[PDB]
Symmetry: C2
Subunit: 246 residues, 2 copies
């Protein structure tokens, strides 16, 4: 049914040289992009270098997008600009942006609306805190977070959800069964808010700590459709993680 | 004599095509980079395109930089990364970032620090609100904003100040701007020394266009500008000329 989706969030890391080396390793993997989505999210200033280096079987995107259009928004990258550059994907709502940059559910909603308007595909992150989990609020928190934006989705292939177990960020970690349980609940939320067919198509990624050791166990879960990978994505062995989804 | 510095803040504007024509027009202007600094600040994803297209007489920079180093800061660009790419300049503390993204004085201080640590050159922005101006607090506010970071400056060619009359963003007269600029230079002198204060460029960051640019730059203490909408136009070259 669902096409699996493996994403590398490089976060704020890299040099021109490190990228050349890593993309080179990545290019050695022969996968079929018609069957699997594999997306790399470099730093904005690294995007051109990275895109040029990566073979086109690899999709590419950026780690954040403006909630505003073009105009007087110094330091921001608009969805129109991304579209002009053929930047395919954007990450929205990463826990780090919510933490450091005070991004809200409202910002996430705006960014999503902007991205969709400009025919961008969106990878939208959410998840609950340790305290929220301790107080048994996980479902309540996620439901609010999803409902913040979910009504905007028209094409359920073009928005991809990520569950971040923010409570884990260390410490840690969710068992694969524990993630699966959350992913199943997220899909129910989509089903009841959007519709069953829609909930059945949408990809839901695990956004916790993923590595060569746990990826197979994670992808095997019924409602886990892929991953947004952090530190492990900075390593040549990331290809092994992609392989788990092949 | 201070070397004049004219900057294009493209803000969140451009396409590959528009930049291609705009840079070509700019390239037609014959100027000597040893006599003035002309810096272009494209959107981040436009940096390589712009840098390639612009001839070397033009300097380039980015519109913001992280206060954090490399690491788990999704969506940020580190000073280290900018250094690796030989991105020469960064803008810090622009009023838009203060307004929309809640950037503080402390943020500005940390951003400057990261930049200097990484041998980037910094164009640092500040200025008072309408309420602050109406309340006759302009000096108190400016002194506070400047003293937030000014002590960090280790080379007075490499950090450039910009006064943004945010109050007027809905202008300042050139005479009004000149008085603020002089006041800024006096704060720098008070904190950094006289020779240092004489050396540092202080730019006007209010609305600049081909009409008003000469009137501003000819003021004793206004050393150039950080230019907005006008910098998106082929006639931006006429603004540069006011500094030539």
């Amino acid at each position: 049914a669902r096409k699996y989706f493996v994403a590398a969030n490089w976060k704020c890391n890299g040099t021109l040289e490190s990228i050349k080396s890593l993309t080179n390793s990545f290019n050695n993997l022969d996968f079929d992009p018609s069957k699997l989505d594999v997306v790399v999210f470099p730093v904005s200033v690294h995007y051109d270098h990275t895109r040029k280096l990566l073979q086109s079987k690899f999709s590419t995107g950026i780690q954040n997008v403006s909630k505003f259009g073009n105009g007087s928004y110094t330091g921001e990258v608009s969805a129109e600009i991304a579209k002009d550059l053929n930047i395919e994907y954007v990450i929205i709502g990463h826990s780090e942006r919510r933490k450091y940059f005070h991004e809200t559910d409202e910002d996430v909603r705006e960014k999503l609306q902007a991205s969709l308007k400009n025919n961008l595909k969106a990878v939208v992150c959410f998840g609950e805190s340790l305290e929220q989990r301790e107080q048994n609020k996980t479902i309540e928190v996620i439901t609010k977070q999803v409902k913040a934006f979910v009504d905007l989705i028209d094409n359920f292939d073009n928005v991809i959800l990520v569950y971040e177990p923010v409570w884990a960020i260390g410490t840690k970690t969710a068992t694969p069964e524990q993630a699966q349980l959350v992913h199943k609940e997220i899909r129910k939320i989509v089903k009841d808010t959007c519709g069953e067919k829609q909930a059945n198509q949408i990809r839901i990624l695990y956004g916790g700590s993923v590595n060569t050791e746990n990826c197979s166990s994670l992808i095997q879960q019924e409602d886990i459709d892929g991953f947004l990978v952090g530190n492990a994505s900075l390593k040549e062995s990331f290809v092994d993680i992609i392989k788990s989804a092949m």
